[PDB]
Design a protein around this ligand. Structure first.
Ligand code: CL
Ligand code: CL
Ligand code: ZN
Ligand code: ZN
Lengths: 571, 576
């Protein structure tokens, strides 16, 4: 549980800040400068540069995104994603990791053999540096008109130590041997226009001077030219610090890498700190050439940078993203189809609620803006739809992305579990939520729950019982119980496979035909001896289908009370 | 529909970049410097400042978040959100707009009158500057020990022209008249310690020299001191450009506002360009004192800056946020209840998928990271949970937020949870799914099922259970006792214990034979119905054998009683 922070305020903490120290283990975590290294960059210029052209975009939805999906893309979902990206304007598209996944291999084979790749589109495939994986990656691109082969190895301080147990030279050699293998394989495959991309993986946790060394050495192997450049792709595999620091890193690399005219400098930001878009836009101002991301920011854990956000951050400040988002609804509808994950309600530009105003005040200002625009448009013999957009609270004309401005005019599971320790089966929440419709407070809701499932002792009251279970696995269990039927003390008895069966059969003898449809039980604290909650759904005749709830210190008794509760609900 | 861009490349555009001009109407949109002004700050210092203290936080969930919801919070939802924020450690909470809505007025009365406000907590209320509204904002607050009155009016180039059709002088008087009224009203209620917050609303669409001018003006009326400071809140009402320019804007206001030592400088970013967190973090290094936001990014349109991301971004780089997030799921569940909007699967720190790894090589590197951390704790006679987190792909120990790392395995219409329920009728508890996933990691339906049987169902060593007699009390809350016949590494022994049901009894029985089984959790469900009906039981326990390990055990049987007993045996045996 959540414990109010209660430790001493910092020394020199303002009188007007009453915040207390928390007990979170901050000391397991270090500043970025200490975890990795301090900023090497003298005379940054990214903070003074405003973006005025589209980067080169590369969409990694088919590999990076797909790898991150609970339900990965079927071959049809892939074609549909591929085709959306092509039709939006993307010229570079990561289509798989052929050497690690047969489905990836077959998909690559499919778009090449089907003739599915437009003439201005380059496909990109991911590989690790092992010779047998490079080989198999080239195998998969066989007969491609042009391909990016993207090889990588982890270079961070952490990984060198704990993943590879390798020093700097050994780790540069993984990368440069990969590059040598790449040059070899490309000569073995004529006619395909081979292009290379190298990532120092976990770049954000790597010494810059070192990343430059590995990169430069890899460039020396490939021998790129201004005509036939290499891509150095520099990922925030984990987003580790603030975007200005990423950007300092990008500017430093851009300035220090050898043979810069032959390098396409590429960014691959993840969103661990919630700042992937910022890292990209500042990194772009820092001298990157290219950005890898996904539509709506799909990718492991927090995701890759959002391509859509980036593109429309350009459009809404007067820069052509060179990608069509004139119908963001279709884009979103297809991305959700392919990924089987929703775009959040608040996601920039695409989310359900982003062109909505609930505030009466905001709606008035929007309309006052919209009117001025029409007054200026009628006074210029003009279509408003071509005027400079000037509307408070709306950054863009919703129409420009195929949307519209919306001027818009029970908590059972939560409260029962939070306040009561009760995990109600879904169908029970449903059944009971209907009952609570006749707002009801938490204290109030509970009184109604108790009155419905816990209190009634008529027509059925269970007084006590003797359970005689078979000692042997699979034997039969006997119950004798003392019950009251409409006040009337009665003995009942039954046999069954276990005690709840025995009790249920026993009930037949007093005019309750009961059949267990569903049953759940859970602990109610930690510990050997804790209370149990039991939930029984039963059809009950003398034929209504009903839930009962039982709470008791025993698994058995809870379950028995759950049956009594059902029977009394049935009546 | 979507048509490929097909316009010409830009002039200068490199041969290796084949993109085409699109038909998007960019001409309807201008650079920020043209839309608003050029913000030049050649001598800025925010890029060289790393954050080393938590800001003063203010939570606006009950106002900016609430206004933004499809379904506004009921009184109960309001109260629940307010209590969560107190309990996390927020000391300033904006509780509503009580002059604008009766439900907000009512809420503010409810908390004041029922004594819900801690001594170290200062409630905040929003108001516009119309004197009837300022009066009603003070009335709402009658009998509060302290409160921040937050008044605002819009000051942007666009609204001054199209919304107000007004002079600079005109629009500034709206503000200073609001301030005057606040001062006169604060005198009518001596029982409350009043503080003021002023926002030039749509700040990011406003000339800086004008924002300063209006704020300075307001401060002259209110006359704050280092001991009674004013708040000046600078909203990115619409997030209009990149967070560096916002940061420049803050550093300049921090350096140039009159009476700076009597100013608490507050930031209030929205997320229209998806960079609200960056704005707040860069703006804080720029010299701000305070940040207004919402848990999980709720609020108007794209939302207010996420307080959880900000606070845990401090935590994970070694700065104490002074807010507890150590059960981020309790926070998530509560926020979802209150807002009735879900926290996205990939939301930083909190989304369902942020502590998972699907990648085989990530999974392998995570394990190597964990093993290496463990060898270092043993070498140092230390708790590994106490030491420097050093695991690739995981910025934090998920346990530090009450979460669990999950190596998610792919099952050949797929997924472990889904295949178990459908093929075998088992609803595995989430933490069992995680645990068993890890077993696999260390896949067809058959491989998965057989792996499952091999882990949890099959083992008869160390412990096996032949038979038992359970003696239940007839009367409720009586003792059950148990004798059981059991083979311990093949040697038949006899065991004895008592407990509140035969589960507990059986667990206590096993302690005489060198198994310390401490039940942490327990679940049971029906499989099938009738005479071909069975019970699935799952038990979580910390188990020690004659070194302690947390494991699940699964048991399946016709009896709800014997299923549970099987579960305990499965548990003891998984631990061995
Ligand atoms: Cl049973
Ligand atoms: Cl029990
Ligand atoms: Zn990646
Ligand atoms: Zn706001």
């Amino acid at each position: 549980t959540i414990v109010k922070p209660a430790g001493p305020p910092r020394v020199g903490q303002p009188s007007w800040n009453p915040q207390r120290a928390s007990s979170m283990p901050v000391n397991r975590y270090r500043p970025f400068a200490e975890e990795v290294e301090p900023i090497r960059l003298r005379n940054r210029t990214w903070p003074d540069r405003v973006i005025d052209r589209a980067p080169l975009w590369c969409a990694v939805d088919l590999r990076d995104g797909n790898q991150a999906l609970i339900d990965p893309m079927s071959p049809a979902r892939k074609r549909r994603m591929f085709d959306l990206l092509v039709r939006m304007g993307y010229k570079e598209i990561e289509v798989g990791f052929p050497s690690a996944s047969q489905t990836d291999f077959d998909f690559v084979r499919e778009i090449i053999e089907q003739g599915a790749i437009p003439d201005d589109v380059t496909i990109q495939v991911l590989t690790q540096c092992r010779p047998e994986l490079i080989e198999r990656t080239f195998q998969a691109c066989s007969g491609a008109p042009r391909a990016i082969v993207h090889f990588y190895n982890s270079t961070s301080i952490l990984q060198r130590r704990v993943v590879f147990r390798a020093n700097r030279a050994e780790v540069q050699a993984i990368a440069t041997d990969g590059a040598r293998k790449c040059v070899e394989q490309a000569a073995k495959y004529p006619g395909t226009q081979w292009r290379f991309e190298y990532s120092p993986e976990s770049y954000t946790g790597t010494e810059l001077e070192y990343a430059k060394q590995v990169c430069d050495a890899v460039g020396e192997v490939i021998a790129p030219t201004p005509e036939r450049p290499i891509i150095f792709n520099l990922p925030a595999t984990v987003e580790m610090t603030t975007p200005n620091v990423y950007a300092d890193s990008i500017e430093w690399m851009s300035r220090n890498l050898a043979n810069r005219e032959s390098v396409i400098l590429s960014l691959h930001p993840h969103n661990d700190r919630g700042t992937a878009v910022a890292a990209a836009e500042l990194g772009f101002a820092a001298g990157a050439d290219r950005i890898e991301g996904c539509l709506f920011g799909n990718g492991e854990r927090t995701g890759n940078v959002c391509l859509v956000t980036l593109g429309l951050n350009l459009f809404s400040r007067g820069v052509d993203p060179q990608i069509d988002f004139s119908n963001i609804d279709e884009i979103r509808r297809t991305v959700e189809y392919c990924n089987q994950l929703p775009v959040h309600e608040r996601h920039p530009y695409g989310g359900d609620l982003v062109y909505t105003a609930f505030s009466g005040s905001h709606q008035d200002a929007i309309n006052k803006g919209l009117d001025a625009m029409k007054l200026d448009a009628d006074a210029a013999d003009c279509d408003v739809d071509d005027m400079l957009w000037q509307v408070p609270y709306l950054p863009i004309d919703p129409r420009d992305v195929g949307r519209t401005y919306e001027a818009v005019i029970g908590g059972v599971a939560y409260i029962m579990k939070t306040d009561h320790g009760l995990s109600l089966p879904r169908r029970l929440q449903i059944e009971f939520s209907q009952v609570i419709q006749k707002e009801v407070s938490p204290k109030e809701m509970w009184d109604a729950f108790a009155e419905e499932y816990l209190a009634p002792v008529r027509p059925l009251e269970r007084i006590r019982q003797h359970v005689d279970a078979a000692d042997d696995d699979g034997g039969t269990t006997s119950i004798t119980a003392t019950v009251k039927i409409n006040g009337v003390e009665t003995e009942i008895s039954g046999s069954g496979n276990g005690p709840l069966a025995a009790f249920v059969h026993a009930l037949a003898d007093v005019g309750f035909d009961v059949a267990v449809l569903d049953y759940y039980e859970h602990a109610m604290s930690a510990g050997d001896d804790a209370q149990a909650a039991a939930y029984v759904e039963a059809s009950v005749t003398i034929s209504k289908t009903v839930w009962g709830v039982g709470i008791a210190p025993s698994i058995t008794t809870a379950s028995l009370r759950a049956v009594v509760s059902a029977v009394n609900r049935a009546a």
